[PDB]
Design a protein around this ligand. Structure first.
Ligand SMILES: [Mg+2]
Ligand SMILES: [Mg+2]
Ligand SMILES: [Mg+2]
Lengths: 113, 99, 102, 56, 33, 100
RNA sequence: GGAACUUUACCAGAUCCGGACAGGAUGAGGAUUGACAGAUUGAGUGUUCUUUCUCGAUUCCCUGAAUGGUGGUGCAUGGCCG
């Protein structure tokens, strides 16, 4: 049902780094290009550990982070990330519809009037 | 870091005794360079500031400040303390005192 | 022969004119061909700041100006002769630069 | 790892926070023209010595 | 109010001697490198 | 027990003196040391044995000292109030890299 | 005073000492400094911890002090400005 740029989840996971960079929009691709030589955040491997520790049938434990400018990759789908909004960590589930967006687009820092 | 390694303190004291004054820009981030018998040596400005703060509290140097720069000058008791610290000869004299 | 250019610049008009006149006289004593002096365009450095510290009251401004005068003289003389001509007590605040033209 | 973290953002040396008045080390109302790097209040205090004058 | 417990003052584990632990004693060698 | 009282003091200048078991052993294993001085009343057989053996492997000299307290007072490991008898920090080993 | 970070003075957290000096305690048989790996954590941040190293009398603890502060008071002032 869910597709990103016409690709379902499994071929999206099969996609490599260069293909995903070419498949993503301009700001995300620029972010990936400028972070190419920089070491990736430890949050990625923390999420990988959390994903590999959960049994099939229930949700992986949430990982808390201050980072907001991380591009959501297809492998991050299914992980639970608690993003800091300034004074609390707000747990969100990474869905396929979130691919290509930043983490900071899902933790609202302010409250509406 | 204000942890001053002993050789850095010895070099600073030797330059302070040779050239009777020391001028250092007041920036937490930065390096101070001095000349001892040719060549150079570099110690962080924070460590020079710490050493001169200790010397000032012990009434051994006179201090002046203008336009982000310190100016420390060894007085008579400071000169005697420097001479005893580096075990220089009693005839050892700063450049500003040598004719 | 070869041309030597003296560039005389200063922020004091009287000092720059005095140095230029002295160089002119010294060169005339040496019987050398002279081009100039050329009075180059005067440049004005402008800094316009608010007069008040803080930000209270009518927004009044200060206009600080600094004017720079430059002169150039060309001497058809060897480098030794030009060095002789410029060897005198120069007025303070006057910068004299020597350049060989092609 | 605190020695690496200490003043790591000031290491970059970009923005208003990396430049201060060469007289008073204040980071507000700096004058960058002609690479003066003097705050406007200190500039008003020192302009005559620097060489500027109040005309017009 | 502090929800977390206070981080304790850092003490260094000091063992006496500690310079003879490296040397196995004669024909003396170093335990590692 | 007389001339070493001048040798150690002269070597104090230019940071030629090295004190403590760990630092003296670090000198002895990695050379760059001219001699070491050991006070016999070190209270540890392993201490004196290793200190002698490290010099022996490197063929470094060794001078015995009858009193640990006197040697400690020599190198300057003493707390003053001129109360040098108030407290003397134990110093069983002294190694010299630069003679002066 | 067109503030993404810095600036920044505010909020939620986490560090460092940038507490000089003096008098006491410990202390080369080591005062202390800095860290690999695992975990604590927002942090492949020795922040703290386990377990191992490394420096070296520079430092730590503890009392008086001291210092810094875009802390207060512009109705205590200077200078400047309106
Ligand atoms: Mg901030
Ligand atoms: Mg008033
Ligand atoms: Mg007033």
């Amino acid at each position: 049902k869910f597709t990103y740029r016409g690709l379902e989840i499994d071929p999206l996971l099969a996609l490599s780094e260069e293909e995903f960079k070419a498949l993503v929009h301009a700001r995300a691709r620029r972010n990936m290009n400028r972070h190419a030589d920089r070491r990736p955040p430890v949050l990625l491997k923390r999420l990988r550990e959390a994903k590999k520790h959960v049994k099939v049938g229930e949700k992986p434990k949430a990982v808390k982070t201050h980072l907001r400018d991380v591009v959501i990759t297809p492998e991050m789908v299914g992980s639970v990330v608690a993003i800091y909004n300034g004074h609390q960590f707000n747990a969100v589930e990474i869905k396929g519809e979130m691919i290509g967006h930043y983490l900071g687009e899902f933790s609202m820092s302010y409250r509406p009037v | 870091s204000t942890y001053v390694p002993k050789p850095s303190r010895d070099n600073v004291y030797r330059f302070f005794f040779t050239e009777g004054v020391i001028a250092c820009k007041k920036d937490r981030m930065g390096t101070w360079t001095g000349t001892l018998g040719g060549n150079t040596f570099t110690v962080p400005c924070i460590q020079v500031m710490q050493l001169m703060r200790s010397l000032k509290s012990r009434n051994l140097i006179k201090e002046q400040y203008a336009w982000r720069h310190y100016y420390w000058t060894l007085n008579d008791e400071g000169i005697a303390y420097m001479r005893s610290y580096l075990h220089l000869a009693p005839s050892a004299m700063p450049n500003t005192q040598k004719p | 022969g070869q041309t030597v250019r003296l560039t005389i610049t200063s922020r004091n008009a009287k000092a720059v004119e005095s140095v230029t006149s002295q160089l002119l006289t010294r060169a005339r004593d040496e019987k050398v061909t002279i081009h100039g002096p050329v009075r180059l365009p005067t440049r004005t450095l402008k800094i316009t700041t608010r007069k008040t510290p803080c930000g209270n009251g009518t927004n009044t401004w200060d206009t600080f100006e600094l004017k720079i005068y430059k002169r150039i003289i060309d001497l058809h003389a060897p480098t030794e002769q030009v060095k002789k001509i410029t060897s005198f007590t120069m007025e303070s605040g006057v910068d004299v630069s020597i350049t060989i033209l092609d | 790892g605190h020695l690496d973290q200490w003043r790591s953002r000031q290491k970059i040396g970009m923005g208003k926070g990396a430049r201060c008045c060469v007289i008073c080390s204040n980071q507000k109302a700096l004058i960058r023209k002609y690479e003066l790097n003097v705050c406007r209040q200190c500039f008003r205090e020192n302009a005559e010595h620097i060489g500027f004058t109040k005309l017009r | 109010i502090f929800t977390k417990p206070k981080k304790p003052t850092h003490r260094h584990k000091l063992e006496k001697m500690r310079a003879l632990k490296y040397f196995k004693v004669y024909k003396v060698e170093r335990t590692r490198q | 027990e007389d001339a070493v009282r001048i040798v150690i003091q002269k070597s104090l200048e230019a940071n030629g003196l090295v004190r403590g078991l760990s630092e003296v052993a670090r000198t002895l294993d990695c050379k760059t040391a001219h001699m070491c001085i050991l006070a016999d009343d070190c209270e540890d057989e392993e201490y004196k044995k290793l200190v002698t053996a490290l010099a022996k492997q490197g063929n470094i000299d060794l001078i015995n000292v009858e009193e640990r307290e006197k040697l400690a007072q020599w190198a300057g490991l003493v707390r003053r109030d001129a109360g040098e008898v108030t407290k003397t920090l134990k110093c069983s080993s002294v190694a010299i890299r630069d003679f002066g």
